[PDB]
Structures are given as C-alpha cells and as structure tokens.
Amino acid sequence: KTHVQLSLPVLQVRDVLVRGFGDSVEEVLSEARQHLKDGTCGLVEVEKGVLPQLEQPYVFIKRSDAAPHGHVMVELVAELEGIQYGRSGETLGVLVPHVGEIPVAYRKVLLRK
Structure with a gap:
C-alpha cells in the first residue's frame, strides 16, 4: 500500500528518552520510516522551546492533503x-523513537509510504 493508517502516541518533549533518529538527513528519514512501520514511533507537538530540546536532523510529519477515516494524510520532511x-504542508509535529514513554494523546495519520 502507498499509504498506511497509523495511530501515533503523542509524547511530552521532557519525557522523550531518545531525542532523534540519527546523524544524517538520510539516516533520520530511514529510521523514522522503519519505526513507523514497526509501531515504535512517537510524535512531539512543536511549540516554542520544543525543537532545541531534540536532536538534529529533525523528522517532521507534514499534512500532504486536505482526511480519510479520521486519519490526516502526512509525509516526512x-x-x-x-x-x-x-516539501509539504503544515507540521503535525516532530517524530522521535518511542521506547515506552506514556503518551498524552494519539494522532491518527495516513502515512504516504
């Protein structure tokens, strides 16, 4: 399937134990896609002070269209x-590895894969 329905655990930035996916643009996009497939990917909502608390390179999910079955269509930047x-739309948040942190919410997305 070109798209996969996912429910992403929304994490508070200060709970996140692994604050990025790696050390190159290509690695962080690779690792993010692997974690999304494996159900081990979290989402941090971007506000003032969030991004400086995480590691670059960053992986964003961005809205790619204007939402099947409650799932916003997103792609990785x-x-x-x-x-x-x-190149994509509005940031839904920044992706991070999920290693068992308790989420505050779930974000239903349709990931272009």
Whole structure:
C-alpha cells in the first residue's frame, strides 16, 4: 500500500528518552520510516522551546492533503541546520523513537509510504 493508517502516541518533549533518529538527513528519514512501520514511533507537538530540546536532523510529519477515516494524510520532511529535505504542508509535529514513554494523546495519520 502507498499509504498506511497509523495511530501515533503523542509524547511530552521532557519525557522523550531518545531525542532523534540519527546523524544524517538520510539516516533520520530511514529510521523514522522503519519505526513507523514497526509501531515504535512517537510524535512531539512543536511549540516554542520544543525543537532545541531534540536532536538534529529533525523528522517532521507534514499534512500532504486536505482526511480519510479520521486519519490526516502526512509525509516526512527532514531538517538539518535550517534546510528542509522535502516539501509539504503544515507540521503535525516532530517524530522521535518511542521506547515506552506514556503518551498524552494519539494522532491518527495516513502515512504516504
């Protein structure tokens, strides 16, 4: 399937134990996609002070369209030193590894895979 329905645990930035997916744009996009497939991916909602508390490169989910079965269609964009790799809509949040942190919410997304 080009798209996969996922429910992503929304984590508080200060609970996150593993604050990024790796050390290159290509690695963080790779790792993010692997974690999304494996159900081991969290989502942090981006506000003032969040991104400086996580590790670059960042992996964003961004709205790719205007929402089947309650799932917003999203795609991945990475960012490293202020340059983005990909082009998409509004940020739903920043992806991080999920290693058993308790979420505050779930974000239903349709991931273009």
